[PDB]
Short mmCIF file of C-alpha atoms in Angstrom, two decimals:
data_model
loop_
_atom_site.label_atom_id
_atom_site.label_comp_id
_atom_site.label_asym_id
_atom_site.label_seq_id
_atom_site.Cartn_x
_atom_site.Cartn_y
_atom_site.Cartn_z
CA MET A 1 -33.18 178.26 142.83
CA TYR A 2 -30.87 175.25 142.84
CA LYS A 3 -31.06 172.94 139.81
CA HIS A 4 -28.84 170.08 140.96
CA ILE A 5 -27.81 169.17 144.50
CA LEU A 6 -24.95 166.72 145.24
CA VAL A 7 -24.71 165.14 148.71
CA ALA A 8 -21.31 163.83 149.76
CA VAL A 9 -21.58 160.85 152.09
CA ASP A 10 -19.28 158.35 153.77
CA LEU A 11 -22.01 155.73 154.08
CA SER A 12 -22.27 155.83 157.85
CA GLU A 13 -25.31 156.33 160.08
CA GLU A 14 -24.96 160.04 159.34
CA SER A 15 -25.64 159.54 155.63
CA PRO A 16 -29.36 158.65 155.62
CA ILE A 17 -30.09 161.70 157.74
CA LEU A 18 -28.00 163.92 155.53
CA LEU A 19 -29.79 162.56 152.45
CA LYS A 20 -33.25 163.13 153.98
CA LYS A 21 -32.26 166.72 154.66
CA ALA A 22 -31.06 167.24 151.05
CA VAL A 23 -34.29 165.75 149.67
CA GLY A 24 -36.13 168.45 151.63
CA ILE A 25 -34.04 171.14 149.94
CA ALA A 26 -34.42 169.44 146.52
CA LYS A 27 -38.21 169.39 146.87
CA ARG A 28 -38.35 173.11 147.60
CA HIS A 29 -36.06 173.96 144.71
CA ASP A 30 -37.45 171.28 142.38
CA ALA A 31 -33.85 170.25 141.91
CA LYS A 32 -32.13 167.10 140.71
CA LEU A 33 -30.44 165.20 143.57
CA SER A 34 -27.27 163.09 143.34
CA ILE A 35 -25.03 161.29 145.82
CA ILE A 36 -21.31 160.79 145.92
CA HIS A 37 -19.67 158.27 148.27
CA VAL A 38 -16.28 159.58 149.34
CA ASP A 39 -13.46 157.15 150.07
CA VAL A 40 -11.23 158.66 152.75
CA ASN A 41 -8.38 156.06 152.51
CA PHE A 42 -4.99 157.52 151.59
CA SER A 43 -4.15 154.65 149.24
CA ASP A 44 -3.50 155.96 145.72
CA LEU A 45 -4.35 152.72 143.93
CA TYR A 46 -6.95 153.16 141.17
CA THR A 47 -8.18 156.55 142.43
CA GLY A 48 -10.61 158.89 140.71
CA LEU A 49 -14.29 159.67 140.06
CA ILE A 50 -16.67 156.82 139.25
CA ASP A 51 -20.32 156.62 138.16
CA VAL A 52 -21.49 153.46 139.91
CA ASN A 53 -24.33 152.71 137.48
CA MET A 54 -21.88 153.02 134.58
CA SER A 55 -18.71 151.25 135.75
CA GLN A 56 -13.87 149.13 139.86
CA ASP A 57 -12.78 147.07 142.52
CA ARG A 58 -11.70 150.33 143.98
CA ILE A 59 -15.33 150.36 144.77
CA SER A 60 -16.32 147.22 146.49
CA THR A 61 -19.30 145.10 146.45
CA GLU A 62 -19.86 146.12 150.07
CA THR A 63 -19.69 149.85 149.47
CA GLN A 64 -21.54 149.39 146.14
CA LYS A 65 -24.53 147.84 147.85
CA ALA A 66 -24.48 150.38 150.66
CA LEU A 67 -24.56 153.29 148.21
CA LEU A 68 -27.35 151.74 146.15
CA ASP A 69 -29.22 151.00 149.40
CA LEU A 70 -28.85 154.61 150.56
CA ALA A 71 -30.22 155.94 147.27
CA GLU A 72 -33.25 153.65 147.58
CA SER A 73 -33.86 154.91 151.14
CA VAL A 74 -35.82 157.94 149.88
CA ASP A 75 -38.48 158.08 147.19
CA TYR A 76 -37.05 161.25 145.63
CA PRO A 77 -35.26 160.38 142.39
CA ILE A 78 -31.47 160.16 142.64
CA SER A 79 -29.84 161.24 139.34
CA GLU A 80 -26.22 160.15 139.72
CA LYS A 81 -24.67 157.73 142.20
CA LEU A 82 -20.94 158.43 142.25
CA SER A 83 -17.88 157.34 144.17
CA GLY A 84 -14.66 159.27 144.50
CA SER A 85 -11.20 158.46 145.82
CA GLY A 86 -7.76 160.07 145.73
CA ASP A 87 -7.52 163.85 145.69
CA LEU A 88 -11.02 164.85 146.84
CA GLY A 89 -10.61 168.46 145.82
CA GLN A 90 -10.00 167.29 142.29
CA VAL A 91 -12.74 164.62 142.42
CA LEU A 92 -15.43 166.94 143.77
CA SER A 93 -14.46 169.76 141.40
CA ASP A 94 -14.77 167.28 138.53
CA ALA A 95 -18.17 165.95 139.65
CA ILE A 96 -19.53 169.47 140.13
CA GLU A 97 -18.36 170.48 136.64
CA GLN A 98 -19.27 167.31 134.80
CA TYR A 99 -22.77 167.10 136.26
CA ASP A 100 -23.63 170.82 136.54
CA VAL A 101 -24.07 170.74 140.31
CA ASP A 102 -24.95 173.99 142.05
CA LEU A 103 -25.18 172.92 145.73
CA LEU A 104 -22.74 170.61 147.51
CA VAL A 105 -24.08 169.21 150.79
CA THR A 106 -21.75 167.61 153.31
CA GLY A 107 -21.74 166.20 156.78
CA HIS A 108 -19.49 166.79 159.76
CA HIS A 109 -17.18 163.74 159.92
CA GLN A 110 -13.58 164.43 160.79
CA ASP A 111 -11.87 161.96 158.46
CA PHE A 112 -13.91 163.34 155.57
CA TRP A 113 -12.83 166.86 156.43
CA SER A 114 -9.19 165.81 156.83
CA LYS A 115 -9.30 164.32 153.34
CA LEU A 116 -10.82 167.52 151.92
CA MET A 117 -8.04 169.49 153.61
CA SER A 118 -5.39 167.32 151.97
CA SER A 119 -6.14 168.29 148.37
CA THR A 120 -2.88 169.22 146.69
CA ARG A 121 -1.51 172.16 144.70
CA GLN A 122 -1.01 169.96 141.57
CA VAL A 123 -4.12 171.74 140.32
CA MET A 124 -5.17 174.89 142.20
CA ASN A 125 -8.78 173.81 142.64
CA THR A 126 -11.46 175.86 144.34
CA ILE A 127 -15.21 175.58 144.76
CA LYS A 128 -17.34 177.88 142.67
CA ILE A 129 -20.75 176.85 143.98
CA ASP A 130 -22.57 177.05 147.33
CA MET A 131 -21.77 174.44 149.95
CA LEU A 132 -24.04 173.53 152.92
CA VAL A 133 -22.19 171.93 155.85
CA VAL A 134 -24.62 170.09 158.07
CA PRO A 135 -24.18 169.66 161.87
CA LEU A 136 -24.53 166.40 163.76
CA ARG A 137 -28.18 165.46 164.45
CA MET B 1 -37.70 176.28 158.58
CA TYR B 2 -35.07 178.87 159.59
CA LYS B 3 -36.07 181.52 162.09
CA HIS B 4 -32.87 183.54 162.29
CA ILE B 5 -30.09 183.78 159.72
CA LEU B 6 -26.69 185.36 160.55
CA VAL B 7 -24.50 186.53 157.65
CA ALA B 8 -20.81 187.14 158.40
CA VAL B 9 -19.43 189.77 156.06
CA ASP B 10 -15.73 190.41 155.54
CA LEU B 11 -16.47 194.00 154.43
CA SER B 12 -14.84 193.35 151.04
CA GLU B 13 -16.40 194.96 147.95
CA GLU B 14 -18.23 191.67 147.33
CA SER B 15 -20.13 191.82 150.63
CA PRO B 16 -23.35 193.01 148.88
CA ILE B 17 -23.39 189.76 146.88
CA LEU B 18 -23.28 187.73 150.08
CA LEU B 19 -26.00 189.93 151.59
CA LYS B 20 -28.28 189.53 148.57
CA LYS B 21 -27.97 185.74 148.68
CA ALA B 22 -28.78 185.79 152.40
CA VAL B 23 -31.85 188.02 151.86
CA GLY B 24 -33.18 185.65 149.23
CA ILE B 25 -33.02 182.89 151.80
CA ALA B 26 -34.53 184.98 154.61
CA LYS B 27 -37.58 185.80 152.46
CA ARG B 28 -38.20 182.15 151.65
CA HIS B 29 -38.16 181.27 155.35
CA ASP B 30 -39.75 184.49 156.61
CA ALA B 31 -36.73 184.64 158.92
CA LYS B 32 -34.91 187.31 160.85
CA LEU B 33 -31.60 188.35 159.26
CA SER B 34 -28.66 189.61 161.31
CA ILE B 35 -25.17 190.70 160.18
CA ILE B 36 -21.80 190.35 161.80
CA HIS B 37 -18.24 191.35 161.00
CA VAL B 38 -15.38 189.50 162.65
CA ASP B 39 -11.99 191.22 162.79
CA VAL B 40 -9.75 188.18 162.47
CA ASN B 41 -7.27 188.23 165.35
CA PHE B 42 -5.58 185.99 167.93
CA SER B 43 -8.06 184.02 170.05
CA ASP B 44 -6.38 185.11 173.29
CA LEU B 45 -7.28 188.76 172.59
CA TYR B 46 -11.07 188.25 172.26
CA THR B 47 -13.06 190.50 174.61
CA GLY B 48 -16.66 189.67 173.63
CA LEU B 49 -19.28 190.77 171.09
CA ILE B 50 -20.14 194.36 170.28
CA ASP B 51 -23.73 195.31 169.58
CA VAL B 52 -23.13 197.90 166.87
CA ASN B 53 -26.78 198.86 166.87
CA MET B 54 -26.54 199.80 170.56
CA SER B 55 -23.20 201.56 169.98
CA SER B 56 -24.81 203.64 167.24
CA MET B 57 -27.65 204.68 169.56
CA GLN B 58 -25.16 205.80 172.23
CA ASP B 59 -22.71 207.47 169.83
CA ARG B 60 -19.98 204.96 170.65
CA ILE B 61 -19.11 204.11 167.05
CA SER B 62 -15.35 204.60 166.90
CA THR B 63 -13.96 202.40 164.13
CA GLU B 64 -14.44 202.70 160.37
CA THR B 65 -15.02 198.98 160.50
CA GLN B 66 -18.07 199.34 162.74
CA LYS B 67 -19.30 202.31 160.74
CA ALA B 68 -18.98 200.26 157.52
CA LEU B 69 -20.99 197.45 159.12
CA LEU B 70 -23.78 199.92 159.97
CA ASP B 71 -23.63 201.49 156.51
CA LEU B 72 -23.80 198.11 154.84
CA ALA B 73 -26.72 196.92 157.00
CA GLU B 74 -28.65 200.09 156.24
CA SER B 75 -28.29 199.44 152.49
CA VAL B 76 -29.83 195.98 152.72
CA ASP B 77 -33.38 195.68 151.32
CA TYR B 78 -34.55 193.72 154.30
CA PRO B 79 -35.05 194.57 157.96
CA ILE B 80 -31.87 193.71 159.83
CA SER B 81 -32.16 192.39 163.37
CA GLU B 82 -28.72 192.33 164.99
CA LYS B 83 -25.61 194.20 163.78
CA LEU B 84 -22.61 192.69 165.54
CA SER B 85 -18.85 193.06 165.63
CA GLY B 86 -16.12 190.99 167.27
CA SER B 87 -12.36 190.59 167.16
CA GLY B 88 -10.74 187.20 167.53
CA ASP B 89 -10.97 183.68 166.16
CA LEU B 90 -13.59 183.33 163.41
CA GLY B 91 -15.28 180.23 164.84
CA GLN B 92 -14.88 181.62 168.34
CA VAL B 93 -16.63 184.90 167.55
CA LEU B 94 -19.33 183.42 165.31
CA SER B 95 -20.12 180.62 167.76
CA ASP B 96 -20.69 183.18 170.50
CA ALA B 97 -23.09 185.24 168.36
CA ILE B 98 -24.98 182.18 167.19
CA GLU B 99 -25.45 181.05 170.78
CA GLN B 100 -26.43 184.46 172.19
CA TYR B 101 -28.97 185.25 169.47
CA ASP B 102 -30.53 181.86 168.71
CA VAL B 103 -29.30 181.72 165.11
CA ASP B 104 -30.13 178.61 163.07
CA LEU B 105 -28.39 179.39 159.74
CA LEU B 106 -24.88 180.82 159.39
CA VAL B 107 -23.91 182.26 155.94
CA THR B 108 -20.24 182.96 155.20
CA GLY B 109 -18.43 183.84 152.01
CA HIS B 110 -15.03 183.23 150.46
CA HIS B 111 -13.18 184.53 147.44
CA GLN B 112 -12.61 181.18 145.73
CA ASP B 113 -9.29 180.54 147.45
CA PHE B 114 -7.28 177.33 147.16
CA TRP B 115 -9.51 174.33 147.95
CA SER B 116 -7.65 173.07 151.04
CA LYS B 117 -7.28 176.53 152.56
CA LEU B 118 -11.06 177.03 152.23
CA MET B 119 -11.92 173.63 153.64
CA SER B 120 -9.52 174.10 156.58
CA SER B 121 -11.10 177.49 157.52
CA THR B 122 -14.59 176.01 157.06
CA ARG B 123 -13.87 173.06 159.34
CA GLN B 124 -12.52 175.38 162.01
CA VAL B 125 -15.85 177.22 162.12
CA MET B 126 -17.88 174.03 161.71
CA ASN B 127 -16.31 172.45 164.82
CA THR B 128 -17.41 175.38 166.98
CA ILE B 129 -21.09 175.31 165.94
CA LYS B 130 -24.14 173.09 165.98
CA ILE B 131 -26.15 174.67 163.17
CA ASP B 132 -26.35 174.65 159.38
CA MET B 133 -23.69 176.69 157.62
CA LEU B 134 -23.85 177.83 153.96
CA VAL B 135 -20.44 178.69 152.47
CA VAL B 136 -20.79 180.99 149.50
CA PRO B 137 -18.36 181.80 146.68
CA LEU B 138 -17.87 185.48 145.83
CA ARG B 139 -16.33 186.38 142.46
CA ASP B 140 -14.94 189.42 140.61
#
């Protein structure tokens, strides 16, 4: 069974629904559940992986509140609240490794997928865990 | 709760791994489990789905590919519902099967290829469907 699920969100209307769905999976697997806000801007200023409860301005007060609000939208405990920017292949690979994630859950948004498809060859990343891609609902 | 899972196998030596993962899920949901193999080809040359189960029953099995699909399905420790084959665009062929057989979970596998290549192929399939899709890594 899964031990730690990570839901990638862009903090849109889609996110709360995606999180509710992941909570359902977490409850069946008795798994830890974490969330990572993904910045899809192509700016390369202060990029990287951030733990929002253990912090920059790359993350804004606006997005900061929205992510904390999303986590409080379900009763299920949220273990890590992260934010990633820059090369998303590298950022997600790092979050999965660092936090021992075994299920990555994502939505359907096009800009998010375009960013994931732009990960570079600088490091030949791959995904070594299951990934559940969730349709629009 | 899922009622019908479809696993798309690439017929590589790691296919059993993908099948075992899919069975584990089918048991948990008490769901039907079907199998499909898509011969990746140009979209313009797609002629429709092939019911390999029906072919078998009418002695129409002609390709080693179809035979391998039947052989693989028979080895699975779970009752298999549909056994399908198609040649064309991955999302095109899978979307068709999903629609025709009321599938609610699609399971696909990859061999841990370069991140962006994987995500690009995944998105292509994702944009042709309206159901959950589990993308599974296959190693060694």
